Design an enzyme around this catalytic site. Structure first.
Site, short mmCIF file in Angstrom:
data_model
loop_
_atom_site.label_atom_id
_atom_site.label_comp_id
_atom_site.label_asym_id
_atom_site.label_seq_id
_atom_site.Cartn_x
_atom_site.Cartn_y
_atom_site.Cartn_z
N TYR A 27 0.89 -1.29 0.20
CA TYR A 27 -0.03 0.01 0.10
C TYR A 27 0.96 1.32 -0.03
CZ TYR A 27 1.16 0.90 5.02
OH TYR A 27 1.48 1.00 6.19
N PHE A 37 1.76 10.16 2.99
CA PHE A 37 2.02 9.68 4.37
C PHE A 37 2.74 8.57 4.93
CE2 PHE A 37 -1.53 7.44 5.70
CZ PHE A 37 -2.51 7.78 4.96
N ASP A 38 2.50 7.45 4.11
CA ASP A 38 3.18 6.04 4.59
C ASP A 38 3.15 5.21 3.18
OD1 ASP A 38 4.12 3.87 5.96
OD2 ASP A 38 2.11 3.38 6.90
N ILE A 57 -8.67 0.06 9.68
CA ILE A 57 -9.50 1.02 9.35
C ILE A 57 -10.47 0.38 8.59
CG2 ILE A 57 -8.37 2.77 10.12
CD1 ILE A 57 -8.03 3.60 7.06
N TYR A 83 -9.77 7.77 10.33
CA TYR A 83 -9.45 8.47 11.62
C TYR A 83 -10.19 9.74 12.08
CZ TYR A 83 -5.70 5.43 10.81
OH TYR A 83 -4.99 4.31 10.42
N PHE A 100 -5.77 5.00 -0.22
CA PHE A 100 -4.77 4.22 -0.30
C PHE A 100 -4.67 3.47 -1.73
CE2 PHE A 100 -3.51 3.84 4.10
CZ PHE A 100 -4.38 4.41 4.70
C1 LIG Z 1 4.11 2.34 9.74
O1 LIG Z 1 2.94 1.92 10.59
C2 LIG Z 1 1.73 1.71 10.07
C3 LIG Z 1 1.02 0.38 10.69
C4 LIG Z 1 1.64 -1.00 10.67
C5 LIG Z 1 2.33 -1.06 9.12
C6 LIG Z 1 2.56 -1.44 11.66
C7 LIG Z 1 1.93 -1.72 12.86
C8 LIG Z 1 1.37 -3.18 12.59
C9 LIG Z 1 1.29 -1.06 13.95
C10 LIG Z 1 0.84 -1.45 15.21
C11 LIG Z 1 1.21 -0.78 16.50
C12 LIG Z 1 0.46 -1.34 17.54
C13 LIG Z 1 0.80 -0.72 18.70
O2 LIG Z 1 -0.06 -2.28 17.57
C14 LIG Z 1 -0.67 -0.91 14.76
O3 LIG Z 1 -1.09 0.11 15.07
C15 LIG Z 1 -1.41 -2.19 14.10
C16 LIG Z 1 -2.70 -1.62 13.58
O4 LIG Z 1 -3.69 -3.00 13.21
C17 LIG Z 1 -2.63 -0.97 12.11
C18 LIG Z 1 -2.14 -1.83 11.05
C19 LIG Z 1 -3.88 -0.16 11.62
C20 LIG Z 1 -4.17 0.94 12.70
C21 LIG Z 1 -3.38 2.06 13.08
C22 LIG Z 1 -5.84 0.75 13.25
C23 LIG Z 1 -6.26 1.27 14.19
C24 LIG Z 1 -6.47 0.51 15.51
C25 LIG Z 1 -7.05 1.11 16.44
C26 LIG Z 1 -8.27 1.59 16.28
O5 LIG Z 1 -8.95 2.45 17.13
C27 LIG Z 1 -8.40 2.59 14.93
O6 LIG Z 1 -9.80 2.94 14.51
C28 LIG Z 1 -9.89 4.26 13.99
C29 LIG Z 1 -7.49 1.85 13.97
O7 LIG Z 1 -3.47 0.60 10.48
C30 LIG Z 1 -4.48 0.67 9.46
O8 LIG Z 1 -5.78 0.05 9.70
C31 LIG Z 1 -4.40 1.31 8.24
C32 LIG Z 1 -4.77 0.46 7.01
C33 LIG Z 1 -3.71 -0.64 7.11
C34 LIG Z 1 -2.33 -0.10 6.59
C35 LIG Z 1 -1.86 1.00 7.62
N1 LIG Z 1 -3.11 1.89 8.09
C36 LIG Z 1 -2.63 3.28 7.97
O9 LIG Z 1 -3.75 4.06 8.15
C37 LIG Z 1 -1.51 3.83 7.54
O10 LIG Z 1 -1.18 4.04 6.40
C38 LIG Z 1 -0.66 4.22 8.74
O11 LIG Z 1 0.30 5.22 8.17
O12 LIG Z 1 0.10 2.94 9.14
C39 LIG Z 1 1.11 3.00 10.17
C40 LIG Z 1 0.31 3.33 11.41
O13 LIG Z 1 0.98 3.36 12.60
C41 LIG Z 1 0.44 3.07 13.82
C42 LIG Z 1 -0.53 4.62 11.19
C43 LIG Z 1 -1.33 4.76 10.15
C44 LIG Z 1 -1.89 6.14 9.75
#
Ligand SMILES: CO[C@H]1C[C@@H](C)C/C(C)=C/[C@@H](CC(C)=O)C(=O)C[C@H](O)[C@@H](C)[C@@H](/C(C)=C/[C@@H]2CC[C@@H](O)[C@H](OC)C2)OC(=O)[C@@H]2CCCCN2C(=O)C(=O)[C@]2(O)O[C@H]1[C@@H](OC)C[C@H]2C
Ligand SMILES: [Cl-]
Ligand SMILES: [Cl-]
Ligand code: NA
Length: 108
Positions: A27, A37-38, A57, A83, A100
């Protein structure tokens, strides 16, 4: 709508993600103006997730479910399916529609 899916290149037209499967993707995430942004592509490492676990998300949950294996698509996701009014600290402003560019590489 929560998500709009626009196809860049077609998938197999047959194999769509189900619960219990691991989706493997590349992605790039951007705002509506294309500002990046990523990206997993920049890390040369695919990203993996599963449906039904609230671990992505909701716009991904509903958008990638509409893709078949091999497809590349633009997912345009409303703030409430991303978000929301908060945004993501350090990364995404409040009330941001996200775009995305997603390639569904395989299901494991
Ligand atoms: C470089 O790190 C990325 C995440 C990954 C590669 C690393 C992991 C496993 C982090 C763990 C750290 C951890 C402590 O567990 C993590 O956050 C896992 C988690 O599942 C993510 C995979 C998920 C997410 C942030 C879900 C939230 C969970 C909470 C709920 O309340 C929220 O609802 C509103 C949704 O990401 C998403 O849904 C979406 C869609 C898929 C691709 C990523 N996504 C993006 O939006 C991005 O492009 C973004 O840049 O990706 C980076 C991310 O960092 C944190 C910020 C966001 C802006
Ligand atoms: Cl996973
Ligand atoms: Cl998992
Ligand atoms: Na997780």
């Amino acid at each position: 709508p929560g998500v709009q899916v626009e196809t860049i290149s077609p998938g197999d037209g047959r194999t769509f993600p189900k619960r219990g499967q691991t989706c493997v993707v590349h992605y790039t995430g951007m705002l509506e103006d294309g500002k990046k942004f990523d990206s997993s592509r920049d890390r040369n490492k695919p990203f993996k997730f599963m449906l039904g676990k609230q671990e992505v998300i909701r716009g991904w949950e509903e958008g990638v479910a509409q893709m078949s294996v091999g497809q590349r698509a633009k997912l345009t996701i409303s703030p409430d399916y991303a978000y929301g009014a908060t945004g993501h600290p350090g990364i995404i402003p409040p009330h941001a529609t996200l775009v995305f560019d997603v390639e569904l590489l395989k299901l494991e």
